[PDB]
């Protein structure tokens, strides 16, 4: 069978990894490679994040822009804030002049606190240093190991959603039930407006807004915003925002799922 999309895409590129073997299917990826360096700088490193159901591999396109050097045995070492545990570095072999290379880090998402879904990552390429002649590509024998520090990288609960459009959400809310929903009150103390809130919830959970949600209509005081997706491990998950503005913007929120976990995820990290 033939790749017809860039997650079947990133799925063949997953499969062929010998070290990935062991892993299930990819659940996602994030939709644009987030640069970890600045612009027009010695390195140029993109990560992609792949979620799985129970890990998350972090791919790394890096280029040397050197042409006096080359770069081999290249990795990303990652320190997390949260309790992931980095199990695995995939090197990139070598990285000559202006040719990008790929190396990964696998990681376990956290089992004590399933709900610490939030993290933020110390990011450091670790790698052998060569010297190269500038017209001929040719590397010594001998080099050094070296390092070089880069952005940090950012995991937030939209890393494990994946929004979609519901036929119906009247009907997928009745049709998921409510053996595990739950509620929080969260008071959103520096925004002021509606139309602000329902942007900022709707971009932190990374879920669909249905049934037009995200319009909120002219000179409001309360607004009902409904989100759906399906959350790591294939499960729906379905969220109702009943915003109220007043001297700032409070919300209800309810969320239901066919599993209990889902629902925890997402009251733990809107609040």
Same mark, same amino acid.
């Given at each position: 069978?033939?790749?017809?999309?860039?997650?079947? #895409?990133?799925?063949?590129?997953?499969? /062929?990894v010998p070290e990935f073997q062991g892993l299930?299917?990819?659940?996602?990826?994030?939709?644009?490679?987030?640069?970890?360096?600045?612009?027009?700088?010695?390195?140029? #490193?993109? *990560?992609?994040?792949?979620?799985?159901?129970?890990?998350?591999?972090?791919?790394?396109?890096?280029?040397?822009?050197?042409?006096?050097?080359?770069?081999?045995?290249?990795? =990303?070492?990652?320190?997390?804030?949260? &309790?992931? %545990?980095?199990?695995?570095?995939?090197?990139?072999?070598?990285?000559?002049?202006?040719?990008?290379?790929?190396?990964?880090?696998? =990681?376990?998402?956290?089992?004590?606190?399933?709900?610490? $879904? /939030? *993290?933020?990552?110390?990011?450091?390429? @670790?790698?052998?240093?060569?010297?190269?002649?500038?017209?001929?590509?040719? &590397?010594?024998?001998?080099?050094? %190991?070296?390092?070089? =520090?880069?952005?940090?990288?950012?995991?937030?609960?939209?890393?494990?959603?994946? @929004?979609?459009? @519901?036929?119906?959400?009247?009907?997928?809310?009745?049709?998921?039930?409510?053996?595990?929903?739950?509620?929080?009150?969260?008071?959103?103390?520096? #925004?002021?407006?509606?139309? %602000?809130?329902?942007?900022?919830?709707?971009?932190?959970?990374?879920?669909?807004?249905?049934?037009?949600?995200? @319009?909120?209509?002219?000179?409001?005081?309360?607004?009902?915003?409904?989100l759906a997706g399906v959350f790591r491990g294939?499960?729906?998950?379905?969220?109702?925002?009943?915003?109220?503005?007043?001297?700032? $913007?409070?919300?209800?929120?309810?969320?239901?799922?066919?599993?209990?976990?889902?629902?925890?995820? $997402?009251?733990?990290?809107?609040?």
């Amino acid at each position: 069978k033939v790749a017809a999309t860039r997650q079947e #895409i990133f799925q063949e590129q997953l499969a /062929a990894v010998p070290e990935f073997q062991g892993l299930g299917p990819l659940f996602k990826s994030s939709p644009e490679p987030v640069a970890l360096t600045e612009s027009e700088t010695e390195y140029v #490193i993109r *990560c992609t994040k792949h979620t799985f159901t129970d890990h998350m591999v972090f791919q790394f396109d890096c280029t040397n822009t050197l042409n006096d050097q080359t770069l081999e045995n290249v990795t =990303v070492q990652m320190e997390p804030s949260e &309790a992931y %545990e980095v199990l695995c570095y995939v090197p990139a072999r070598s990285l000559p002049y202006n040719q990008p290379g790929t190396c990964y880090t696998l =990681v376990a998402l956290p089992k004590e606190d399933p709900t610490a $879904v /939030a *993290c933020t990552f110390s990011c450091v390429m @670790k790698f052998t240093v060569k010297d190269c002649d500038p017209t001929t590509g040719e &590397a010594d024998d001998e080099g050094y %190991e070296d390092e070089y =520090v880069l952005e940090d990288l950012e995991v937030t609960i939209a890393d494990h959603i994946q @929004k979609v459009m @519901k036929l119906n959400f009247e009907a997928a809310w009745d049709e998921v039930g409510d053996e595990f929903q739950k509620e929080e009150t969260f008071t959103l103390s520096t #925004i002021k407006t509606l139309e %602000e809130a329902v942007g900022n919830i709707v971009k932190f959970l990374g879920m669909h807004p249905c049934e037009r949600s995200d @319009k909120v209509p002219d000179n409001k005081n309360t607004h009902t915003l409904l989100l759906a997706g399906v959350f790591r491990g294939g499960h729906d998950i379905l969220v109702r925002s009943r915003l109220l503005l007043l001297d700032t $913007v409070t919300m209800q929120v309810t969320a239901r799922s066919s599993e209990e976990l889902p629902v925890d995820i $997402v009251l733990a990290s809107v609040g």
